Structures are given as structure tokens and as C-alpha cells.
Design a protein around this ligand. Sequence first.
Ligand SMILES: COC1=C(OC)C(=O)C(CC=C(C)C)=C(C)C1=O
Ligand code: SF4
Ligand code: SF4
Lengths: 96, 79, 67, 92, 178, 385, 56, 157, 317
Amino acid sequence: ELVEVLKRGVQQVTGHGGLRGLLRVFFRANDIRIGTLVGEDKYGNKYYEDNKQFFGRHRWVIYTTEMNGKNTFWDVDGSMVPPEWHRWLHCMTDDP
Amino acid sequence: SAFLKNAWAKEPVLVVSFSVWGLAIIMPMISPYTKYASMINKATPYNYPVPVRDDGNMPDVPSHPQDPLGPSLDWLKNL
Amino acid sequence: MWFEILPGLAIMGVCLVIPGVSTAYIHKFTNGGKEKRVARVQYQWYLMERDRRISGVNRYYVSKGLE
Amino acid sequence: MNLYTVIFINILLSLTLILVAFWLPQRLPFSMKFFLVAITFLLFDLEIALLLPLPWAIQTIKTSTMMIMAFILVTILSLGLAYEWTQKGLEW
Amino acid sequence: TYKYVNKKEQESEVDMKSATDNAARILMWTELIRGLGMTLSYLFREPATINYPFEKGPLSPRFRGEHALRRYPSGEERCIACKLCEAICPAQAITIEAEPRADGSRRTTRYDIDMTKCIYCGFCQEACPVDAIVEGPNFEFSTETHEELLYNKEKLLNNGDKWEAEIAANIQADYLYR
Amino acid sequence: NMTLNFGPQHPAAHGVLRLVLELSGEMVRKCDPHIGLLHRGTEKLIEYKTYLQALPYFDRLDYVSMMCNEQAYSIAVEKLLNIQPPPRAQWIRVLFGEITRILNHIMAVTTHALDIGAMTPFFWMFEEREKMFEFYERVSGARMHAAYIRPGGVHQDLPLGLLDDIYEFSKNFSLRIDEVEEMLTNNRIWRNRTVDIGVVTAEDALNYGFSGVMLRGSGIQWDLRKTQPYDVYDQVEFDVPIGSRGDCYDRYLCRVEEMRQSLRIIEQCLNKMPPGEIKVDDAKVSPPKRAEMKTSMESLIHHFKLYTEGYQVPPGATYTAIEAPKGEFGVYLVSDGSSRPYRCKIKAPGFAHLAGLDKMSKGHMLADVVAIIGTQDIVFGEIDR
Amino acid sequence: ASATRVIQKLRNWASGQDLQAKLQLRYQEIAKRTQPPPKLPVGPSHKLSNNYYCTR
Amino acid sequence: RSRAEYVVTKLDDLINWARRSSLWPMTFGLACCAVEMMHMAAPRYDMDRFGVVFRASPRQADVMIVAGTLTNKMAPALRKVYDQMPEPRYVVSMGSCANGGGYYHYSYSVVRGCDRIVPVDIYVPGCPPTAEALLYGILQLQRKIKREQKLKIWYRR
Amino acid sequence: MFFINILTLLVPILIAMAFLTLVERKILGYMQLRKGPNIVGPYGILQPFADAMKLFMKEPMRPLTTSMSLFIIAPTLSLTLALSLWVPLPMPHPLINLNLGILFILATSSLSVYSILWSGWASNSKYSLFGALRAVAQTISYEVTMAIILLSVLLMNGSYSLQTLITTQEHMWLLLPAWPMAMMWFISTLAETNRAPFDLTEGESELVGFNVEYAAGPFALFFMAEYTNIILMNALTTIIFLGPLYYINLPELYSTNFMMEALLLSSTFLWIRASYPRFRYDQLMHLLWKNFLPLTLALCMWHISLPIFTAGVPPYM
Ligand SMILES: COC1=C(OC)C(=O)C(CC=C(C)C)=C(C)C1=O
Ligand code: SF4
Ligand code: SF4
């Protein structure tokens, strides 16, 4: 029971790389959740999908560190996602 | 009585309100303990009990606190 | 999930126990390991004061049968 | 003194805030009902007073008189309330 | 067929049991406690919010979003300045003036969609015979200055080139329907 | 009397409302609502716009019931053209019309509570509302302001997954009404705030032209959906939720019932939607299909003329009323033979309701007025037009 | 969903309803995207015969 | 690092972060764009998460979102409410009705843009500008608020 | 050392004040199907500090028509009284134990009604004055039953000192007995902190009155005051009616349980807010003068009788 939830929690925390990775995700994406990388675009954005979660949150993008020169560590904006991968993120097309 | 009934179901606070007003106006009158309050509080010794001179004409007053004479609070004990 | 509300509550809680443990150990330090005497009525202040005079200047110091 | 120490820190903490707050940045509304309430309020507030010594008066040796007195006070004020209800008062 | 809401069919005469049940409802706020239970229940439900930058609310192919002008795969811009996109725009947003290009082809010298005037109806998407003007998927084009929102042919053609891959996929999915 | 205006910025004022209140103490003796803060000139602009390019305007008059609004213009223009929409389109308009009444009622019941002070009902239902817009967006491309219901028929066929998704929403939606049902229908605090407030007598409601849930709440039995069945409201079965007494509670209870009755109508529409075309096959009225205009000359000519010039509806005038979620929404469209209308008087259920505020809010406190506006479901787009 | 049974039981009770059966959040029940291509039906008036407009 | 310049860059970074993290918006509520934000306040796209107040009186509002047409009868008011907002204040114009006249541009009763009435910081486009789209616009305001360097300008002034 | 203690009581309480705000914005959230503030900082922990800094930086506005003292005295008084009332509270040991402690708490609360009156007069705009007059009335009315409910308690405690109740509640909470008043103390605690079911003092839909003309630093100080009170009154419920277990050998399990009960009852008024619509101005006074005051006055007499005829007169001292 409760142990299971704690267990999956550990998986999540330990999942995003070392503590460095977790902090990278914890502080800029504000979500420690692990999914399956569905691809990495040439800009650097990494896209993931967790079909187990609800429709709203089964597909997420972890934006890059630098796009077109600008640092995007903290100043992440949606448009960073490339037009090709925009529809996958918005569920316009179910195909990566 | 009938209103009483609806009153119990409509405006059911006043009913309870008055009921308590009365029950507090009755229990004191009829109770096996009411008398104790004036005693239990009377007994509580707050001010030093000054001793009286022994003219030697008093058999009621105990010459010593632990003597078998005088007032007792065994009523307070085992109350 | 609701568990995220916990972090905030925890910080509140820790910050509501400090005061109760703090006030109740800064008393047992200043008064020599003995709870600060509560002098509700004068008698108690008298006894307390009497204690001061009995030893040092502070009432917490307490002389015993060996005096 | 101990209280004085605490309180002045209390005012200081608040005056500090307002000061920084102002320094860091660098006609006929009347209803008798409202007046009436205020009045009732004190009539009740005074009664609260005549009722406040009851904790010390509980220990009074009389007891019978205590309760007889206290019950009369609470009952007569409540009747005052009763007439307040009966009259348009308390009906805003 | 009608239905009475809040109409008491009959006068249930108070029975002590009934009265008590009611009086208890007023005295011990029973129904109020019922309401608290409902909110406590959801507190335990999973929240429906999405991380906005990381996750995006789903939009299907017909989403109108932001205007773009497409080009033929060869590289010839699709618009042939028939100018009925201007005719059917409800807001008077699109302004088109044209002249025969040197090639001899028909093309628009100036195509200006005033996006602040546009109410994103999507009729222009509808009206175009060559389907040169399309409602592109992007909805995030908020701009610091009002002038940036006014769009000339070069911004729209550039918008078209950037989003052509998804626009083509979206039109691919919905053309049978149209 | 301490004149005080309920200024626009205040949240309870729906953004634009300047109710000049005369406060006889906290009791308010007179209200003189000053609307006009959102008059956009909707009906003088329509005269300069062709019949299709004026459809969009009708999605912005009441902005919380978009498609039902554009079903009144679509029925009017269709009458003046003696054309009728194809069978599938009429079911789709009834399917979308009830999704809009659920959408308006979630708007009206939850925002009323927001005004009274209950905040949670709004959040639970608003998530259920974006679920619904998605249905608009998936069928038209706009979350709201769709332009889907066209003067003849509807614009595009339903995507191939919408009816399954509408079933899943309707299947679980009733529990969601049940949940605010428990949280805001027996709370003594709601009942006290809503019961016996703004009672309107039956004859007074007819005389003031209330014509809506306000008409039905006081017991008058009138639904334009059963009395004068527009579209297919003759082939769907539902019960009008007539209230008995008229207090703002009976009107709330009626609005909650209509959401439930609309789920009954939505069920029937999914169960019985016919195979067919979504727009009438007269190229003169409804634009030719994309493939046809690109392969047949008669279709390009018909597409060019329809988009550039217009339907050119025959000269006449009609008043067509449909039961919009707020009440009777009617368009008096006067038409010369021209492709652009001559007059379009939008009867707004709301111009009549707001007039009633002074009579309905009689002997009432400043707080009661907040409930009185809430129970008229007034959106100032329709009133201001 | 994805709730430990106990939380679900508390949920169902506090609400008084089997909220699990009808969750608001959508999970793999919603129509998949890229539903198959649609071949829509052509209505009447597309006959190539006896279709005179004057008669319609 | 040690330089009066570095201390003044870091401290505005602090002042900018506070204003950026807690923007309390005040929505006039004109037309329908107010609904497309009532959806932002709602659960699918919470705004509070980002530090946005669902309802804030003018005197306690950092951002004014003008949603809907600004008629010539509400203009004199918008300016008042903008003028009565506390100094640090920003405006986000939502809707083609507000940023520009949109449908109703040529009307005699509609101001062709709120930019004519109140200075506008971010213009969010779309007839019902989508709710993510407003959320992107509010996030763009946060990017504009991060870039501002008020303390640096006072130091080198 | 005394100052150290002064700091230990005020600083932690103030920090707790801040995080209550955060907790109010997440528990209300999850109840309404939304995460609440988690993006600033980790899980929103830095969120309370963030708007505090935004509030103090924004320009404090002094309305053209405004007193400049009855305007700045009002938030100072509100924070000063609320933080002050934490001075004499048993946890289990009080910083400044006062023999007439509960009379101190009742009197200090009463003084806060002025701040509302002074701020309303100072603003010099109609919304403020109307709001203040109704507000003062609510607060004052909910003082008359608030006081009588305490007098019933005291008579079963024997003294006005809050420290005595730790010895009165060594065997059972005063909720078991006197539960009927707890409820009536809880509802009155909801009125006196102008929280939701009774938030007409400052209704938002009604008169968007107390802070109408108050922004930035003044807004914050009352603000802080309200939330600290929200805790204090809940804490008084957790000493007077829910008596945390006291062991003389280890004093902190008293504070540990005081921590737990205070947080849960503080959670309860958060839960009440989201769950209920706000009462009408007269509906609010109708409750106190009609529904509660007759119940309280009668149950007050029952608490002068229960002691005497049950020979249970409480021991003074
Ligand atoms: C549902 O009815 C309406 C509201 O009240 C609940 C409004 O608040 C508003 C505007 C409110 C704001 C401040 C977003 C509008 C436009 C409205 O239509
Ligand atoms: S319709 Fe298509 S092609 Fe004709 S002008 Fe407008 S855009 Fe260019
Ligand atoms: S912009 Fe489009 S949506 Fe926003 S108000 Fe003007 S019309 Fe309504």
C-alpha cells in the first residue's frame, strides 16, 4: 500500500539523473515525473510521454538549456518547442 | 402541545434554550449534592485558624488538631 | 496530489512547536533547572522572596536540611 | 516589566513594518438599527461585567444566594432581549 | 411534459421522530457537515491542472490559431490575389493590392492581415480557392507592441514557412471533412 | 438616500454595470441600472455586412451561449430563404444547443455562487466546461465563438471521434451536477441567501416580458422548445422544469434541472443522429464542397459569388425565437432582396430581465441585489448589443 | 485515479458517491487522435439526372 | 563577487523576482475575453500556481487585463481604475477587441484599442484569445518584468 | 534570555502566519481540483515571502481624502494586538503568565474592532464607511456571545488564568462537557476573524470595506494580523476546549499535540471557507442574537448550577 507509493516516488526521484538532474527538473520544470523519451529535437528540447497519467498530462516537454543562443535554463517559454513537435505536444496528431 | 411539537422542529433552539434555563433552575433545588457546595467551599481553609484561649471550660474544642474532637471533612473525603 | 500541501503545513508546525518548547526550556535554564515559580498569590511571592534571602540572591538556589 | 518589554517590541515590530512600507517603495450613513445595536451591546457588555466576578463568587460560602442572584441577572437581561425581539428591535 | 421542482406534494404532519430529526438538523448543523465532506473528498482527488510551459492543453487539427500564407512545394507562393479572402473577411482585416509580377503571373504586392482587427473566424481559411491563407496552429504570438500585431506579406509568408510542416499535416487530416 | 453606484470594475457587476443604488440605510430603495457600457453597435454593423459575415456577430451577443445564439440567426435566415437544413445538421444543432445550455447553466449557477461567496463550485464545473469547449474546438476550431452553425445547415461534419467523447462526458457529468447539488442546494446559508428573494408573481413576469427561466420559475409553463418546436425538438423528449414559487432558489433549482434534462436530450441525439449531409445541397445558399469547387465550373462560380457577394435572401421580414439558455433569443431580420441585411433587431433575453431588477429587488438589502442580478443570468453583451 | 485504495475509500465516503466510477480526469478513454480518414456522404441533388434546380 | 555594480544587479534581480512571482491581476471583465480567463483561473490552467490572484481590487492589483471591447462609455472608467492602481502596475490587453478594435473596430461606440486609453504592456491576440494564450501572455509579462533594471539605472544615473 | 524567548514566540508565529497563507492557497486548491502555488520555489514554500516583498515595494497610496494617522495607526494596531495576544498563552508554559489571562485575551481582541472603525473613517470613501459600520457591528456582536461562552468555561475551570486549564483537562477535554459551546465558540471564532462563512466585514462581491483604500504595506500588516489571529483563536480552542495531554516530566508532548490540534482546527476554517457561501449581514446577526445568545445565556446559567448541585465547585487557584 503506502509503501508502494513511496517506492514509485523513489523511482521518480532517482530517475532523473543524479541529484543534479533532479534539481534541474525540480526547479525549472517543477515536476519530478519520469516518462519515456519520445525524442530529442535538434534544438535540444526533450519530449516525454506517460500514457498512464490523465490526458492533460501524458505528454510533456522538458525544454533545452540554450535555444538559438538565448539561455533557456529558467526563461523557458512555450514557443521554444519546434513547429514539427508542437502538434505532438498539443495532441493534434498522436504520432511523434 | 402541538406548537410545542413544531417548535421542536421549527425554531428548535429556543426550545432547547428554555429547557436548559429551567433544568438549571431545578437541578439545584433537587439534588443529593447541592448542600455540599456550601460546605466543600466553606471547609477549604484559606485564612489561618486562630486558636482560642483555654479557659478550660470548653469540652467541644479540640486541644490539638489531630485530636478526636472538632470538625471533620471525611464527608469531603470519600465524597 | 494533496501531499504537496504538506510541505507548507510542516513548516507551519515546526514553527508552532518551537515557541512552546522554547519558552519551556529558557525557563528551566534561567531558573536553575527548576520550573519558574508561579506566584499567583502573594504568599507565593513571599515564599519565593524568602528563598532569595535565604541564599545567594536568586531564589532558584535552594538550601536544604544541611543548613 | 516583562510585559512592557514584550509589548514595546510588539509596537516596534509593527511601526518598523509600516515605516519601511512607506519608505522602501522608493456622509450620512445612518440606521438606528446600527445605533440600537451598539446600545444593546453595552447593556449586554455591562452585564458581562456583573457576570465576570462569578468565578470568584462560586467559592462564596453562601452559594444559594450566589446562584439566586446570578440566575435573576441572566433571566432579567434575557427578558430584555425578549422584549427587544418582540419589539421591532433585533429585526433590523 | 413538465416537472415541479421545489413543489411539496403534501403536508407531512410533524411526528416527534420527524421533529427530532429536523431539530437535530438545525441544532447540530447536520447538512453543513455533509457539505464539508464533499470538499474533503476532492482534496484527495488528483488535480486536473497542466504544467503550462511543459505540457499543453490539447488542440485538434481545425484549431484556427494564427494566420499564415502557404507556398507550393516548388516554392511559388500559393496566393494568386483573387482577393475574395478580403471580400469575405467579416472585420475588414485583410488588405490586398496586386499587380502582374514580372514573370507575368498574378501575385499580391501587399497582403496585410491586421490581427488586432481579425476576430479569427476562419472564413478566410474557407474562402481561398488555392487555400493559400490558412489558420495556422500557433496561438502564442502575444507581442509587446501594437505594430508587431499588424502583419504584412513577409511576416505571414515567414509564418507559413515556419509552420508549413504542421499546417500541411493539419490540412491533410481535415480536408476530407471539408 | 446615499446614492452609490455598483461600478463596473467590481466583480459582481459582470465587468460592465453601473447600478445607481439609492441606499435607504443598508436597505436599497431604488435601482437605476445604467447599461450601455458594452454597446458595440452590433446591429448597425450587421447592416454593412453580408449574411454569412454577420454570423460571427451573433456568437458575441450572449457570449456564454454561442451556438444557441447562432441557431437563432441560422433559423431566421433559413426561413427567409424557404430552405431547411439537412436532417443530420438539425440533430447536430440540437446536440450543440444542449451542450451550450449545460455550458450557460454551469456559467450561471457557479458565477452566482462566486458572487454570494461559494468559490469551489465554480472550479469543479469550469474543468467540466473546458472538457465541453474542446467539443466546440474539435468540431469548429474555436473553443468559443465557433461560427459552426451556418445560416444554411452547419459548416463541417463532426470529426469521427466526437460522439464517443460526448458520450463519455455526458456519462460522468451528472455526478458533477450531483456534487455541487450537495454543496449548494441545502446549505442553510444558500437557501437563506436565495429562498424568498426576488419573488416575481406570474402575471407580472409575463407583463415585464421576462420570457425565460424567470417565466418558468414562477410556475408559468412556457418553453419555446416544446411549444414552438424549432429544429428537431419535436423528435426529442424532455421535461420542462417548471418551478413553483419564484424565489431565487426555485429559479436555481430549475437551472440545475435543465442541465439534467439537457443530458437527457444529448443522450437521445447521440443515440439517434442520422447518416447524411450537414449543409443543404443548394449551392445558391450553402457554399460548394472543397473538391467540387476545384473540379467543376458551376461550383467555382457558386463559391466565388457566395463568398464575395452573398445569398441574396428574398425580400421579407421575420421574427424567429429559439429558447436560448437565458430565455427567448429572437432576431427580427428585415431583408431587402440584397445579400446584406437591412435591420437585425436582436431580442436579448436580458434587456427585459434587467428592467425587472428594480421591481424584483424591492425591500431588499445591498447583498440581495448581488443575488438578483445573478438569478437573471444577465450577460451584458446581449443587453448592450 | 492512481489512488491508493484507502484514499479512494475516503474519497468515496466523504463525497457519498462512487466518484471512482466516473472520474473527471480523462485516461485512455478519450477518442484517440488521428481517428481514421472520413469519407463523408454526398447528399441529395447530386444525381446527374432529374435534378433540375427550378424544381428545388 | 565584489562591486557596487554586482550588488545593484543582484538586488533588482531580487526586486524583479518578487514582482514577477506575485502578479495580482485585476480583470475589468468586459465582453467575453473575461470568460477565456475565468478558464485560466479554473483548474485546467491554474493561474494561482504561477502566483496569480483570481480576484484583486484595483488598489491591490499589479496587472490589469482588459478583456473585451472598450466602448466609449467604459473608457472614461478604465482610465480611472488604471489611474487608481498602485504605481508598480502593468496592463495586458486581451482580445482583438481590446488590442485594436477587432470586430467592432469601425463602430461609433467602440474605442479602437485600449492602447488609446491606457498604456499597454503585452497584447494577447485572438477573438477569444485562448486561455493558454493568455497564460503565455502573462508569462511574457513575467519575462518583461525580469528584464527591467530599475536599480541599475538609478546607480548609473 | 527573556528577549530570546520574546523572539522565539514572535518570529516563529510570524513565519507560521506566512505559511498559513500558502497552506490556504493549496488546501483550497486541491479541494477545487487544482494544484495551487507550486511553481515559485519548491512546492510553493517561497510563495509567501514573494508577495510580501511585492506588497512592501508597491507604492503605498494615501487617498487625497484620508487621515494620515487613523490610516497608519490602524494596521499597526491590528498586528500589535494579534501578535501581543500570543504573549500570554499556555504552551504549556506561558511567556508572561497572567493571573487574569483570559480577560487579557478578551480585552485585546475587543480593541481590534477599532482598527476596522479607524480605517473605515480614515479612507473617506463611501465603500469604506459602510463596510466599517457593518463590520464593527459584526465583530462587536460576536463579542457578546464570545465573552459569555468563556464565562461558562471559566466557572468550570475556577480561574481566569489560561494555565489552570492544563490542570482542569488532565483527564478529559472540555469538549466532552461543554461541547455545545465549543461549536458556538468555533462559529464565533469564525466571525471574529472575519473568515468566510462570516466574511461580510469585507465582502468582495459586496463592497470588494476594510482594505478598500489599503494597499502595499498597510494591507500587509492587517493582513498579517488576520492570519496570526486565525491561528491564535484556533489555538485558544486547542487550550480551552481540546486540552492537549500534559505530562510534567516532558513539556513538549503538550506542545506537540497543541501543534497537531491547532493545525487541524486551523485547517478546518480553511475547509469551512471553500465549503460554504457567505451569510447575509442580517442573517449573521440573526444567528448571534436569536439563535446563539439565548442558547449561551441559558447554558451560562446551567454552568453556574452544574458546579453547585453536583458539589463540583472548582478549586480556586
Ligand atoms: C457569468 O457572468 C459574469 C460574471 O460574474 C460571475 C462576471 O464576473 C464577468 C466578468 C468578471 C471578471 C472580473 C473576470 C462576466 C463577463 C460575466 O459574464
Ligand atoms: S483567397 Fe487565398 S488566394 Fe485569393 S487572395 Fe486571399 S489568399 Fe491569396
Ligand atoms: S475579442 Fe473576440 S472575444 Fe474578446 S471580446 Fe472582442 S469579440 Fe469577444
